[PDB]
Design a protein around this ligand. Structure first.
Ligand SMILES: NC(=O)c1cn([C@@H](CO)CCn2ccc3ccc(NC(=O)CCCCc4ccccc4)cc32)cn1
Ligand SMILES: [Zn+2]
Length: 349
């Protein structure tokens, strides 16, 4: 009813798509930007999807709300905080949250995002503020939280400062680097920018995830494993298109960060098909359940859980093992990771 009331782990959720409708009206109103509408209510319904659209119809969503938050220090910090209490309500005990620091900035970034005017919020103090509110979320709401800073495909030039933001803000709360945005652009996993950033990540012990095979071919996953050296995959559905690659990843115990509900809504999965997750369930792969963008997809974690237990016969035993897998493949230090494990066993039995 909730499908699974037991603590949970989430490894794959974007901050900048888990923003309360109510607080976007609050900052659009207080700053000029003025959204396409002005009850909370009527706002969620347009900035949210119920059906697949195209890529530019998807990005335009960002184009309503982002400029109302980006570039206000006030806002950056609250959304971080409000993110943590949103997760306490889902029953999460540990989450990793990801975002691009450049996309919330308005100076020392080129271009300037969202066609904002120039201010003085730089990439590097955005990571400082999210960290703040993420920490005081932690200690008010009971949810252990870390973060992930996203590289953007289209912009290899930002990547090297992503990886240095990762190193400078190390366990306080940044634990990994990611690559997001549009794995359709040719060759983008092999751009020199992204490549040397992941090399520097390897060099300096920052953990790695990549979004790959959501909408891209299995060759994009292969680029992610062999050349970017990821430790985990965002989505990775398209690895199923290549069977040796799939079998090998299974042997290697790769972690797949699955977004079930996300997948239907985006078009990455078409409901006339096998869901990739049930395959992963039947093959006992290492995967997690995640909601990706609850603002956009209209959703909550328990949405993912309900869709998996209703439409695909998951059971309570699977749900527990997948959260155990999630924890094991989390990017915590080994010590805090054993304590997380122990916690879950004790409440799973
Ligand atoms: N789910 C996501 O892809 C996502 C990305 N973000 C932020 C960072 O946390 C980036 C927002 N953003 C800005 C430029 C940009 C360019 C591309 C993408 N993402 C993609 O290309 C993934 C496509 C998402 C799946 C899909 C496919 C086809 C049609 C509709 C939807 C995000 C982008 C938040 N959520
Ligand atoms: Zn994602």
């Amino acid at each position: 009813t909730p499908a699974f009331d037991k603590p949970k782990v989430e490894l794959h959720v974007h901050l900048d798509g888990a923003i309360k409708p109510e607080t976007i009206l609050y900052y659009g109103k207080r700053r000029g930007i003025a959204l396409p509408a002005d009850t909370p209510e009527e706002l969620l319904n347009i900035i949210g999807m119920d059906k697949p659209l195209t890529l530019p119809d998807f990005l335009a969503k960002f184009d309503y709300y982002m400029p109302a938050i980006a570039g206000c220090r006030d806002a950056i910090k609250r959304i971080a905080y409000e993110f943590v209490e949103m997760k306490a309500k889902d029953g999460v005990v540990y989450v990793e949250v990801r975002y691009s620091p450049h996309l919330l900035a308005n100076s020392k970034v080129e271009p300037i995002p969202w066609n904002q005017a120039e201010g003085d919020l730089t990439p590097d103090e955005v990571v400082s503020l999210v960290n703040q509110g993420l920490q005081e979320g932690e200690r008010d709401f009971g949810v252990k939280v870390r973060s992930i800073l996203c590289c953007m495909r289209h912009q290899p030039s930002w990547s090297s400062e992503v990886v240095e933001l990762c190193k400078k803000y190390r366990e306080q709360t940044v634990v990994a680097i990611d690559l997001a945005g549009d794995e359709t652009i040719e060759g983008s996993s092999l751009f020199p920018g992204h490549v040397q950033a992941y090399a520097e990540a390897v060099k300096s012990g920052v953990h790695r995830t990549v979004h790959a095979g959501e909408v891209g071919s299995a060759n994009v996953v292969k680029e992610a494993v062999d050349t970017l050296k990821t430790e985990r995959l965002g989505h990775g559905y398209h690895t199923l298109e290549d069977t040796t690659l799939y079998n090998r990843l299974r042997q290697e115990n790769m972690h797949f960060e699955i977004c079930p509900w996300s997948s239907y809504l985006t078009g990455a999965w078409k409901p006339d098909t096998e869901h990739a997750v049930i395959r992963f369930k039947n093959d006992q792969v290492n995967y997690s359940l995640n909601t990706d963008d609850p603002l956009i997809f209209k959703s909550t974690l328990d949405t993912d859980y309900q869709m998996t237990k209703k439409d695909m016969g998951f059971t309570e035993e699977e749900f527990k093992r997948l959260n155990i897998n999630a924890a094991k493949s989390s990017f915590l230090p080994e010590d805090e990771k054993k304590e997380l494990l122990d916690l879950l066993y004790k409440a799973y039995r």
